[PDB]
C-alpha cells in the first residue's frame, strides 16, 4: 500500500494479470495503465487486485453497491430515485421487488426512503437499483433520520467489522441502522432522544477521521441528551 498521485508511474508490471479497481485508468489510445486519483494504492498478492483508496464525497453509481435513495417521481414502469442531491437521477423498476407481479405494483409514494442495490450502472445510461436480492434487507425505511457522510467513512462502516462506531452505539442504545455506500446512513431508535443522539455521534465521528475518538464522543453526546 503506497501513496500515488495522478500521472505517476504505475508500479505493477504488464506480465502479471491484474483486475483494475477504482482509481486506475487504462488509456484507450496508449493502452497504458496509469492512476487518475490521488491516494493509497492497494495491491493484492496472488489474480492480483489493484486499486486506489481516495477521498470523495460525491457518489458515483457502481454495481453491487448498497445505497439509500429517496423517491422523487413516479413514471410509467419505474421510479425516479435520487441517491444524492444535484446528482443525476436513478431508475427503480416496479418489477424490482420481491414477489413482484404485473398485478401488484409497489406502494411507495414520492418522498419515501428506499434501501436498494445497484444492478446496472452504465456510464452512458441512467443507473438502476433493485429491491430484490440478486442471489435469491431491502425495502422502505419507515421514519428514522438520514445522515450525510463521506464515502470513505461509509465504506469503512459497511465492510470493516473492526470499525468501532457500530459497537459504541450499541453499547448506549438499541438502534436500527442501514448503511449506504453513497454517503447516507439511516438510523432509527425507539425514542426520538436516542435517534438524535445517534445522529450527533455519527456526525461528529465522521468529521474527526480518527478511529480512537469514537468512544469518548458517544459518551458525551448521550450525556447531553440526558
Amino acid at each position: 500500500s503506497t501513496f500515488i498521485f495522478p500521472g505517476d508511474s504505475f508500479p505493477v508490471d504488464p506480465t502479471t494479470p491484474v483486475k483494475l479497481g477504482p482509481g486506475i485508468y487504462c488509456d484507450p489510445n496508449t493502452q497504458e495503465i496509469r492512476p487518475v486519483n490521488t491516494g493509497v494504492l492497494h495491491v493484492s498478492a496472488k489474480v492480483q487486485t489493484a486499486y486506489i483508496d481516495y477521498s470523495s464525497k460525491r457518489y458515483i453509481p457502481s454495481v453491487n453497491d448498497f445505497v439509500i435513495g429517496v423517491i422523487i417521481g413516479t413514471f410509467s414502469d419505474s421510479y425516479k430515485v435520487s441517491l444524492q442531491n444535484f446528482s443525476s437521477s436513478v431508475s427503480l423498476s416496479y418489477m424490482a421487488f420481491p414477489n413482484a407481479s404485473k398485478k401488484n405494483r409497489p406502494t411507495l409514494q414520492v418522498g419515501d426512503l428506499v434501501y436498494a442495490r445497484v444492478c446496472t450502472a452504465e456510464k452512458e445510461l441512467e443507473a438502476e437499483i433493485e429491491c430484490f436480492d440478486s442471489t435469491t434487507g431491502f425495502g422502505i425505511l419507515e421514519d428514522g433520520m438520514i445522515i450525510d457522510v463521506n464515502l470513505n467513512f461509509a465504506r469503512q462502516l459497511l465492510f470493516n467489522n473492526d470499525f468501532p462506531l457500530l459497537k459504541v452505539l450499541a453499547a448506549h442504545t438499541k438502534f436500527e441502522v442501514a448503511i449506504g455506500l453513497n454517503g447516507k446512513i439511516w438510523v432509527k431508535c425507539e425514542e426520538l432522544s436516542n435517534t438524535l443522539a445517534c445522529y450527533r455521534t455519527i456526525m461528529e465521528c465522521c468529521q474527526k477521521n480518527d478511529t480512537a475518538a469514537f468512544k469518548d464522543i458517544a459518551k458525551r453526546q448521550f450525556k447531553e441528551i440526558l
Binding site: G137, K174, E176, V177, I179
Partner: peptide, 10 residues
C-alpha cells in the same frame, strides 16, 4: 455475505 441493515444491541 455482508449485512447492511441490522439492529444492534439485542
Amino acid at each position: 455475505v455482508i449485512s447492511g441493515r441490522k439492529t444492534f444491541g439485542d
